[PDB]
């Protein structure tokens, strides 16, 4: 089965993983150095042992590909993954004019009618950036974000460089190339980050027609983080190709601390009970070629069946 | 055996690596992504089934945690893995006045007398360099190379970022962090490089007293290149160990494209024909504690029983 790389990776975690804390204070059961290789020509990597959200994984995947680093786009699209960042950041500033929200994300767990508060004070916070443009231009925009690290590098001259635009022409003039790489590190900016890239680096590779990605992750959250993160960079696998007019190759996807929460234990167990099912499959536009200028409805994935969602909490 | 990761990675793509040519038109035999591992504990995998200069990779390794990027130190070091690169530049520039030079990493293979030749002239000009302060200071200057990018990273403001540095400082303060990344890639710079960093990214990490680090090297000459990679990076990671004062773990050697000149075929086999011996052992000097100060007798390699060196032609 397809899948099997995921759970070897969270068994073996579950079996060598020494342990490990971190920021959150929560205990972590630690790798280092890990690499999964899926080969793309047998299926799409979406996890069956539990329901992954697809249209999640394809919002995410289109707002970067726009070069874009507002949530308004992914707000429109019902997809919250970003919502955090953005409120955090309207909490710390002037204007806010509302219960003190100090430490929301930790005590959410915690304070029930906290949860409560927070959340329609988030729901208010999104409202006002999908509305008011001069609101969305100020807090909607998070900044360094995969959007503008693949497209929008900011050079020491004031300029601008899309790493992926042009990576991509490469491919098409130079595939046997080995400088096809997308960095989404720069040494100027992590030291004042909220969150460095854990997707940190990844590079092309073409050799028989099939195109194939080998993708860095140098922080991985082995439950929540992974299942996206597998189908997050097989669809790019599949974009690009389309695109290129190749074939899909492998990917691969090699890790540095790979992780699993300590409060995510019995949850993971859970899913090791269960036998995966055949993979679905990916379904691309054959009108469109510019993935620029993909939507929603360019892509399809057909026979997606899986088991129920397990359901796990975010230890911030 | 120690080094058997590096014969299994060889004849794996004696194997299954898939033909491939690339710039020097000379073909190759590569594979995509691989992950070799090396417990530093059990000893330092410094090849045995063939000798490898370990005194060279010293004098490259000192230089870049030097932050220095000139020849002038290396060449009193006698060693000359840089010089095609600044000779590379004189030739190209004004004031040259000598026999034409161009193409002379290709012709000297085939011209004998122009071999003959061009080693004198390179002869000259690493003397000028050596001793001319005005002439190694424009052309032994490489501009940028591992020393620059490790410890002075230029940044959009026209200042300096020493990577190197404050990871080591991290390591002291938060050793179980996960950002302890040091990147060689700048997508301001590679667009018109001479040749962007093949040892894109390492990370470093802490667990249990010890000091591991993972290299991602986005290309690698299998025959030539990965024995001094794997001695350079086991070298470091024992050099930042001793200074903050933990063990060593483990090298994580994770690859791109990986590959083997099929002029290198016939040695490659040679070599695996042999059975290592028991590793060398490193020692470093007690005294001395802040590695950018170290020396070359700092640093003492016991125990090195290694085979003749085999010999094997540069394809550029
Ligand atoms: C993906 C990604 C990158 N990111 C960014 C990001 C930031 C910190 C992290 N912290 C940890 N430990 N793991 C992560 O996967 C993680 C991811 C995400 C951020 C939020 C959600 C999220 O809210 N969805 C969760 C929980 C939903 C819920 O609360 O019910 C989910 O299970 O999908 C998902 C991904
Ligand atoms: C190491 C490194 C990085 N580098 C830079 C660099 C640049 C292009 C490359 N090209 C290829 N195919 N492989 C490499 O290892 C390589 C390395 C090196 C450059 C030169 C030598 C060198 O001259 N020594 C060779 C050959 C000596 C000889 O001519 O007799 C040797 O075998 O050591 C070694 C390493
Ligand atoms: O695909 C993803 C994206 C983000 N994160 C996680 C990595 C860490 O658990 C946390 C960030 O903490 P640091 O690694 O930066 O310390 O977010 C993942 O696990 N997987
Ligand atoms: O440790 C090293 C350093 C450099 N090179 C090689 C990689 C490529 O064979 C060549 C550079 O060519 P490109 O990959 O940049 O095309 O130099 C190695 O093999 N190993």
């Given at each position: 089965?397809?899948?099997?790389?995921?759970?070897?990776?969270?068994?073996?975690?579950?079996?060598?993983?020494?342990?490990?804390?971190?920021?959150?204070?929560?205990?972590?059961?630690?790798?280092?150095?890990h690499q999964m290789?899926?080969?793309?020509?047998?299926?799409?990597?979406?996890?069956?042992?539990?329901?992954?959200?697809?249209?999640?994984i394809?919002?995410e995947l289109?707002w970067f590909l726009?070069?874009?680093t507002?949530?308004?786009?992914?707000?429109?699209?019902?997809?919250?993954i970003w919502?955090?960042?953005?409120?955090?950041?309207?909490?710390?500033?002037?204007?806010?004019?509302?219960?003190?929200?100090?430490?929301?994300?930790?005590?959410?767990?915690?304070?029930?009618?906290?949860?409560?508060?927070?959340?329609?004070?988030?729901?208010?916070?999104?409202?006002?950036?999908?509305?008011?443009?001069?609101?969305?231009?100020?807090?909607?925009?998070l900044?360094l974000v995969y959007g503008s690290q693949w497209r929008?590098w900011?050079?020491?001259?004031?300029?601008?460089?899309?790493q992926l635009?042009?990576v991509?022409?490469?491919?098409?003039?130079?595939?046997?190339?080995?400088?096809?790489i997308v960095s989404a590190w720069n040494?100027?900016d992590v030291?004042?980050m909220?969150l460095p890239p854990c997707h940190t680096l990844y590079q092309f590779?073409?050799?028989?027609?099939?195109?194939?990605l080998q993708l860095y992750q140098r922080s991985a959250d082995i439950?929540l983080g992974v299942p996206f993160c597998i189908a997050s960079y097989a669809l790019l696998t599949?974009?690009?190709?389309?695109?290129?007019?190749?074939?899909?190759?492998?990917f691969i996807h090699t890790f540095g601390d790979a992780?699993?929460?300590?409060?995510?234990?019995?949850?993971?167990?859970?899913?090791?009970?269960?036998?995966?099912?055949?993979?679905?499959?990916?379904?691309?536009?054959?009108?469109?070629?510019?993935?620029?200028?993909?939507?929603?409805?360019?892509?399809?994935?057909?026979?997606?069946?899986?088991?129920?969602?397990?359901?796990?909490?975010?230890?911030?």
């Amino acid at each position: 089965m397809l899948e099997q790389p995921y759970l070897d990776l969270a068994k073996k975690v579950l079996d060598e993983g020494h342990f490990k804390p971190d920021r959150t204070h929560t205990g972590t059961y630690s790798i280092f150095g890990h690499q999964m290789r899926f080969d793309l020509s047998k299926g799409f990597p979406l996890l069956t042992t539990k329901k992954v959200p697809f249209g999640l994984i394809k919002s995410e995947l289109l707002w970067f590909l726009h070069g874009d680093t507002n949530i308004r786009f992914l707000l429109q699209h019902r997809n919250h993954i970003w919502d955090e960042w953005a409120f955090e950041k309207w909490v710390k500033s002037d204007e806010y004019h509302g219960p003190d929200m100090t430490d929301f994300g930790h005590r959410s767990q915690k304070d029930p009618e906290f949860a409560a508060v927070y959340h329609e004070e988030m729901a208010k916070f999104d409202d006002r950036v999908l509305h008011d443009d001069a609101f969305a231009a100020k807090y909607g925009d998070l900044g360094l974000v995969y959007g503008s690290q693949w497209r929008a590098w900011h050079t020491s001259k004031g300029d601008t460089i899309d790493q992926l635009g042009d990576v991509i022409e490469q491919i098409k003039t130079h595939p046997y190339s080995r400088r096809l790489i997308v960095s989404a590190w720069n040494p100027e900016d992590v030291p004042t980050m909220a969150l460095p890239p854990c997707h940190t680096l990844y590079q092309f590779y073409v050799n028989d027609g099939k195109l194939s990605l080998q993708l860095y992750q140098r922080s991985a959250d082995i439950f929540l983080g992974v299942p996206f993160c597998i189908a997050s960079y097989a669809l790019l696998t599949h974009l690009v190709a389309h695109e290129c007019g190749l074939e899909v190759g492998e990917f691969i996807h090699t890790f540095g601390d790979a992780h699993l929460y300590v409060n995510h234990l019995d949850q993971i167990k859970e899913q090791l009970s269960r036998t995966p099912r055949p993979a679905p499959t990916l379904q691309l536009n054959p009108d469109k070629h510019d993935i620029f200028d993909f939507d929603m409805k360019d892509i399809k994935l057909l026979n997606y069946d899986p088991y129920p969602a397990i359901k796990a909490p975010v230890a911030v």
